[PDB]
Structures are given as C-alpha cells and as structure tokens.
Amino acid sequence: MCLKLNLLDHVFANPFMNAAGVLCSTEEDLRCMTASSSGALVSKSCTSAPRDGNPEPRYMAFPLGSINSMGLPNLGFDFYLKYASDLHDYSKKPLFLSISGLSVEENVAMVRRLAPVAQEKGVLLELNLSCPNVPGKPQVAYDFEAMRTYLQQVSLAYGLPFGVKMPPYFDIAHFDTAAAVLNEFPLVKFVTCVNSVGNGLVIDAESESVVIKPKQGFGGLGGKYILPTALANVNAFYRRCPDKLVFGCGGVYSGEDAFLHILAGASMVQVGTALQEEGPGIFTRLEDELLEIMARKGYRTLEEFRGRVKTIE
Amino acid sequence: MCLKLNLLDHVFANPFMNAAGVLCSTEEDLRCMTASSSGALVSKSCTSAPRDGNPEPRYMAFPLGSINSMGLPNLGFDFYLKYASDLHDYSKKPLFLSISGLSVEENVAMVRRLAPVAQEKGVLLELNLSCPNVPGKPQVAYDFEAMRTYLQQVSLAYGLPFGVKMPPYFDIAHFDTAAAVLNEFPLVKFVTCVNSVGNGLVIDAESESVVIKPKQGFGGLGGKYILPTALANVNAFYRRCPDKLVFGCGGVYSGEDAFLHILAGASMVQVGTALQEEGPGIFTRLEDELLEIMARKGYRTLEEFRGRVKTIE
Ligand SMILES: Cc1cc2nc3c(=O)[nH]c(=O)nc-3n(C[C@H](O)[C@H](O)[C@H](O)COP(=O)(O)O)c2cc1C
Ligand SMILES: Cc1cc2nc3c(=O)[nH]c(=O)nc-3n(C[C@H](O)[C@H](O)[C@H](O)COP(=O)(O)O)c2cc1C
Ligand SMILES: CC(C)(C)OC(=O)N1CCc2cc(CCc3c(C(=O)O)[nH]c(=O)[nH]c3=O)ccc21
Ligand SMILES: CC(C)(C)OC(=O)N1CCc2cc(CCc3c(C(=O)O)[nH]c(=O)[nH]c3=O)ccc21
C-alpha cells in the first residue's frame, strides 16, 4: 500500500501539501512545512514588492471553516526566489512557488526571473488567477478575456510547464468556458481547484458585528463550508481537461475528505483552513487516515481510484 | 411576542416563510404551509406546462446541508394560479407565487395571467432568475444583459410590484453590476438572496458514488454550507438597493441564524433545507428562538436591528 506519486517530473512521498497562504509566508514557515510529513509545499502568493496586507483582524476561524481578507501580505518575490534558488532542500520534497501579481505586467516580470531557477532547481510555478485586477472588474479568473491574456503572456514569458490556481465556479456554462480557456495553453500542466469561495460574510450574533476588519467584513471562505463546491470543481476540470493534472483544495480535514478529492480526480491534495487550525501535525494524521480507508477497500495505490467517482445510471 | 410586521401592503405575523420549492408543490403542501405558524408561504417555482422533473434520487440531505437537482417538477402554472385565485385563505397569511419559465416568453405569458389575480386577491410574484437561459449559456441572473431583458419584459407585461429570487454572487464587481440592473426597475420591490449555491458535488465515501442521479451528481447546495454566502448577499443587496426590501434565504436552522439574516438586512426570512428536514413545526421553534434572542438583547422590534450589523473600525 502506498501514497507515492510521480508527476510533473517529480516524486512525491504522498499527495498532501499546504494550500498557498497557509504556513508558507516566512523562511520559518517554509522550513516548518519542509520538516513536516507533507509530500510537497507551496510558498505564499507573492508580488514584486513586499506587502503588509490588509488591516487586522483579517483571518478568523470557526467550527465550519474560515474567512479571510489577508490582502496578499508577503515578503516579496525576491525573497521567495531566493528561498527556491538557495535555501530549499529539494531532497526533502518538491517546492511550488505561487505568484499573484496585481497586473499582467507584474506577473510577466516575476515569471521571467523565475524561469532560469525553475529550469535549474525544479521549482514549480502555481499562478494564482483567483485574484484582483482592476478595481470594479471581477477577479481575473471570472473575466475570461483577462484570464486568456494573463495565460498568453505568462506562457510566452515563462516558457516552461506551470499550473494555475482557480476560484470556484457555480454554473456549468462557466466550467465549459473556463476549461476551454485553459485548454488553449499547453504549458498549463496542472489546475488547482479551488481558491476560497469568494466574498462570504460571517457575523457574530453576540456582538452583532462582522469578524474581519477589511471590506466591511466580506472575505473568502474556506473549510467545511466549501468541500462540495471544491469537489465539483475538481471533477468538472478533471472531466474537461484530460491532458492536464488537477490538484484539489478545499475542505480537507481528514483522509476521508482527501479520498473524496482523489475520487473526483485530484492528484495532489492541498490543505488550508484545517492546517492553519491544527498545525503541520495534520499531515501524519491525513496520511494514516487515507491509508486506513485504502486498506479497507483493498486499494494499493492512488491511481487505482483517482477520478473513479461513480455516477448513478 | 410579537414579531408582527407590514410590507408590500400586506401584514405578516412574523418574518418566516418557506423557501420556494420546499413544502409547496401540491395543494396538500400549500395547505400544510398555510396551517403552519409561518408568517407567509411561497409556491413551488412553476412553468406553463406541468413537469415531472429530473430522475430520482434528486435531493439528498446531510448534517451540513443539502444538494438537489430537482429539474422544476411542478403542477403547472394553471394549478398555482387556481390555488392563488380560488383556494388560498388570505385571512391566514399572505401568499407569494414563484414563476420560473424556461424563456422570457414563457415568463411573460404567465405574468400577464397572474396580474389580474394579483390585483384582485393580493398574491405576490417572486420571479426566479436563478433559472436556466438557453442551454450552454449561464443561468439568467449570471448573464446581466439577459437579466435586464427579463426584467424589462416582465415589468411591462405584469405592471405591478414584484420581487426576484437571486443566485449568490461571489465577487464585489458582480454585486455592483447586479444591483445596478435591479435598481433600473422600480416595480422590483423585493430581492430574495439567495437561491442554492450552484453546482456542488457530494460524494459518498463508502459507495465511492455521487448521491444524486441528474447531471452526474452536480446540484445546488443549501443549508449550513451556505449561511455566510447568504449573509453576504443579503447585506450586499441591502446596501446597494436602499429603495427595495431584501428577503433572506440560506442556512437558516435557528432563531439565531434568522437574527443574523435580519442584522444583515433581511425583512422576511425563508427556510428551505431545514424545513425540508424538520417539517413545518420548525416555524414555532424559530419564532420562540428569535423572540428569546430579542428579549435577551432588549430588542422589542425587528426594525431596531434590521440592517444594523456593525463593521470594524
Ligand atoms: C489565511 C489564508 C491565506 C490564503 N492565501 C492565499 C494565497 O496567498 N494564494 C492562494 O492561491 N490562495 C490563498 N488562500 C486560499 C487557500 O489556498 C485555499 O485555496 C482556500 O483556503 C480553500 O482551502 P481550505 O478549505 O483547505 O481552506 C488562502 C487561504 C487562507 C485561509
Ligand atoms: C428540494 C428543493 C427545491 C427547490 N426549488 C426551488 C424553486 O422551485 N425555486 C426557487 O426559487 N428555489 C428553490 N430551491 C432553493 C431554495 O428556495 C433556497 O433558495 C435554497 O435551498 C437555499 O436555502 P436553504 O439553505 O434554507 O436550503 C429549492 C431548494 C430545494 C432544497
Ligand atoms: C490589493 C487589495 C485591494 C488590498 O486586495 C485585497 O483587498 N484583497 C482581499 C482579498 C485578496 C486576495 C488576493 C489574492 C491572494 C489570496 C488571499 C489573500 O492574500 O487575501 N486570500 C485567499 O483566500 N486567496 C487568495 O488567493 C489579493 C488581494 C486581495
Ligand atoms: C430544464 C432542466 C435542464 C431539466 O433543468 C435542470 O436540470 N435543472 C437542474 C436545476 C434546475 C433549477 C431550476 C430552477 C428551479 C430550482 C430548483 C429545481 O427545481 O431544481 N432547485 C433549486 O435549488 N433552485 C431552483 O431555483 C430549473 C432547472 C434546473
């Protein structure tokens, strides 16, 4: 029985990794994720310049999940490029570097510089499309013209295999259209579904108040709230993007949730809210739990069930 | 008590009602909701002709909510019109009729027949926008130009105050655009936020199978999964549509949940999944619970806290 994966010309001990933005902002965080039993890690989404992010409180968690409006606090691209180029021990596990520029030009500028490091060290790019562009326009991945522009320019500037982090969609015509855009770009080799469910609002009944300060309390939702949304997205893209990998993210707290992701088509499985809340010890639990479900069912490898979710009639 | 309230020229004993599609399809269902302690009821969304709906199983519930792909099973518009004109006892509580034709023309044909019954008896129209357009296009509310057309045509054909049932949005630019469309129609006097969160996917780990038959297991989500999404939408519309009322729907299981919807801006509060699961006795529990929260806080009216959610700093 084994959790090993080979993909993207890397080897992974298991499919688990942090979701971007969790336990991955500082050198300390990145060393901590490396020391964990995760099969990979991804760095905090970066911008060209360091950022302080939004005013606090900007993250809160609850029994059913979390809400955030972090605002891209990060140490800046040079820091993450350095971590990838000089500090990361690739004999421990593979490294993904997430980028989230606030314009197409900013993304092009970062990927041009990443490319020689990616070629030489094997760091993998995850481009975050579930982000702001022009205020008053939708996030990039909800504006299919902007999305196409971003992927054209990044493909040209990077010239190497990469992946994309996608917001959730809620409408079959949007799945159709989004996957068709992605399928224009052969360098897009993995699709991460999903980023937070956007612009939720948590209200505390005792205080009669929202729980995060930015944006009048509106923020993206993670955790138990979003598992069926995440599974739908992983399967929708798994079905529409047969020459690409799908990584699942959203609502994983247990090996059973991970099992569901993998049945829907996930290769790697990312852990956000549950990791923020429990800490990196979660990875040993998730491994043990997933192996226990496999052993009950007689599955010996991930391939033997990945994408094999059954439909009715 | 009491939680009595007046709007749209009608008087309501309390803010609670069923959500469209729950306990409202048959004469039996409608008489059951009428006999309940709810302050109002709404009929199943109808089409011109009777419909069987999609294959079963098409609804499933779980501790955190529900998933459905019902496919508009209903008795047809002639039935619901007859119920509104001849059968409903308006002395018990107000009635709303939900219309969900599959084209703009179908909606126009139904509203021109409803209009005289609305004038004579006081039935209220809820137009469901969270309904399919042409297949291969997004649902109507997700296509702003189609939405505008629907509303111009209905407004013209109907000529009386009505409301609309909206899908959730997840992007502030979308809230801006959608509210601006609705505000172009002075006959749209109430906005119901929200319909189910679209196209989720629930998988059963033991059977390794999706849990509903239509659409390869994809369906709209209701219940605990969607409460922060519902609150955000209620609040976003409440803020943007100061000359309309907002009706809250999504994730109400308790008077506390209802309390949160009203803080967010809700005038009426609709109950779907929790009503499907608990039955119509839920309305006496919700009233008791809401009045207890009120008494503990010193609130004597809903108007004292409606829309008064506090932001930070
Ligand atoms: C505190 C916080 C920070 C996040 N930062 C980023 C980010 O920098 N880039 C990104 O792609 N996603 C970010 N996300 C989204 C997560 O990567 C993940 O997609 C989302 O939380 C859903 O997974 P979950 O249900 O396991 O939380 C962040 C989430 C949280 C809670
Ligand atoms: C079985 C079922 C049938 C439904 N049918 C309709 C409908 O006919 N028209 C409508 O506007 N919404 C319909 N809905 C959506 C609900 O009215 C409601 O918006 C959604 O379930 C979210 O509320 P909840 O969290 O209380 O379930 C239906 C929901 C369910 C669960
Ligand atoms: C640039 C400006 C307007 C300060 O941005 C923001 O207010 N936000 C709030 C949410 C957000 C998200 C992003 C993308 C990074 C990200 C974040 C994040 O850093 O807040 N949180 C997530 O859950 N997923 C993400 O992909 C960037 C900017 C902003
Ligand atoms: C016309 C056709 C293709 C059979 O429709 C469908 O398969 N569906 C699946 C979901 C759906 C919804 C609607 C709108 C009525 C409705 C339904 C419903 O009847 O399925 N469920 C909800 O959660 N909200 C709704 O607003 C109409 C058609 C369809």
Curated annotation (Swiss-Prot), chains A, B:
Optimum temperature is 37 degrees Celsius. The keyword Cytoplasm applies. SUPFAM superfamilies: FMN-linked oxidoreductases. Keywords: Cytoplasm, Flavoprotein, FMN, Oxidoreductase, Pyrimidine biosynthesis. Substrate binds at K44, N68, S69, M70, G71, L72, N128, N133, N195, S196. It is found in: Cytoplasm. Optimum pH is 7. One of its GO terms (cellular component) is cytoplasm. Signal peptide: none annotated. The keyword Flavoprotein applies. It catalyses: (S)-dihydroorotate + fumarate = orotate + succinate. Disulfide bonds: none annotated. Its cofactor is FMN. FMN binds at A20, K44, S45, N128, K165, V194, G223, G250, G251, G272, T273. Gene3D superfamilies: Aldolase class I (3.20.20.70). Homodimer. Belongs to the dihydroorotate dehydrogenase family. Type 1 subfamily. Catalyzes the conversion of dihydroorotate to orotate with fumarate as the electron acceptor. Molecular oxygen can replace fumarate in vitro. This is Dihydroorotate dehydrogenase (fumarate). It comes from Trypanosoma cruzi (strain CL Brener). The lineage of its organism: Eukaryota, Discoba, Euglenozoa, Kinetoplastea, Metakinetoplastina. The gene is pyr4.
